[PDB]
Amino acid sequence: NRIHSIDSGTRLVDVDAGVSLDQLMKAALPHGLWVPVLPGTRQVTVGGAIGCDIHGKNHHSAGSFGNHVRSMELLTANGEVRHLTPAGPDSDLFWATVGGNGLTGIILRATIEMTPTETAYFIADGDVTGSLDETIAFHSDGSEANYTYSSAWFDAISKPPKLGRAAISRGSLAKLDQLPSKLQKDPLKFGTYRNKVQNLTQFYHGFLQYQFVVPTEAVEEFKSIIVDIQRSGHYSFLNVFKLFGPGNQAPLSFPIPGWNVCVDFPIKAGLHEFVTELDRRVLEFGGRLYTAKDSRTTAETFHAMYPRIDEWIRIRRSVDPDGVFASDMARRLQLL
């Protein structure tokens, strides 16, 4: 539950899996290092970050968390401790562990290649659009290459042509060159605008959370989902929009390149019926659902989202035949 080494030269960090990403951030910053993929909470451990293979606002530029793990140590069911690497032997067990939710064993420790930075602040441009078509067109001009971080809040309640209008926030880690004099003293500690310097809390800022992704090319199909959601009467206020980049070698990693949306549906009458249809619609276009604890996602649907599901299940069995690390969700999703 400690951090063993930090090297700015190699950007490598040796850290136990029980260490929270927050604690990792604090320690790594003075060395001019930035955690490659940021957590949603301060209780997210390194092991959780790898097991869930978390993604953030910078996925199009940096991928998910598994992309940055140089090696990890997996305490398996037989009592062994396996040295896992993304490109060496046992790489299959590596990528099955990035995917798996601890169903492969217990991650004890990992080596993580950090992101080099000169400051702890973001420099951001903010834009507002007027409709869903504008929001899409805004992310389709190839301007995503100019910003490492990018996300948008959007209207899912107003009917067209106001549906899909968005407040977009995009930016990158600020250089020392870009900081005001007051902030250059300590650069590495703790809706329309341009060149706005923001710290972590400013930039990165009952219900049923629903997150999915539709392939980039199926844009009209994605628009149709958003339209149908507004029609349904299920109105969410907290809606996040994001365009994902390429995915992993992890067979159970969620992100794929395409349009990613996270809504918070208020628990209403006829929601489970609507969600079931929404699940089918996402899958129909070759999309994928984010499988959380709140799912509410059939095993048939789960196996359909992931083409390499059987390839993963084989690996899980070879490392945990008696299903020691098998949770109730794992059995429910028929992953045994």
Curated annotation (Swiss-Prot):
The function of this protein is: Component of the DprE1-DprE2 complex that catalyzes the 2-step epimerization of decaprenyl-phospho-ribose (DPR) to decaprenyl-phospho-arabinose (DPA), a key precursor that serves as the arabinose donor required for the synthesis of cell-wall arabinans. DprE1 catalyzes the first step of epimerization, namely FAD-dependent oxidation of the C2' hydroxyl of DPR to yield the keto intermediate decaprenyl-phospho-2'-keto-D-arabinose (DPX).
Q: What effect on the protein does mutating C262S have, as reported in its record?
A: In strain: MN84; BTZ043-resistant
Keywords, A to Z?
A: Antibiotic resistance, Cell wall biogenesis/degradation, FAD, Flavoprotein, Nucleotide-binding, Oxidoreductase, Periplasm
Q: Which GO terms describe its cellular component?
A: membrane; periplasmic space
**Parent sequence residues shown:** 77 to 460 of 460
Say where the protein is mainly found: periplasm
Query: What family does the database annotate?
Result: Belongs to the DprE1 family.
An example of a GO molecular function for this protein is: FAD binding
Question: What is the protein's given name?
Answer: Decaprenylphosphoryl-beta-D-ribose oxidase
Activity regulation field: Is inhibited by 8-nitro-benzothiazinones (BTZs) such as BTZ043; BTZs are a new class of antimycobacterial agents that block formation of both cell-wall lipoarabinomannan and arabinogalactan via inhibition of decaprenyl-phospho-arabinose (DPA) synthesis. BTZs are suicide inhibitors that act via covalent modification of DprE1; the essential nitro group of these compounds is reduced by DprE1 to a nitroso group, which then specifically reacts with Cys-262 of DprE1 to form an irreversible semimercaptal adduct.
Residues annotated for FAD binding in this entry = G40, T45, V46, G47, G48, C52, D53, I54, H55, I107, Y290
Q: Which domain of life is it from?
A: Bacteria
Q: Where in the cell is it found?
A: Periplasm
Q: Name one GO biological process term.
A: cell wall organization
> Species name for this entry?
Mycolicibacterium smegmatis (strain ATCC 700084 / mc(2)155) (Mycobacterium smegmatis)
Phenotype for Q211A: 10-fold decrease in catalytic efficiency
Q: Which reaction does it catalyse?
A: trans,octa-cis-decaprenylphospho-beta-D-ribofuranose + FAD + H(+) = trans,octa-cis-decaprenylphospho-beta-D-erythro-pentofuranosid-2-ulose + FADH2
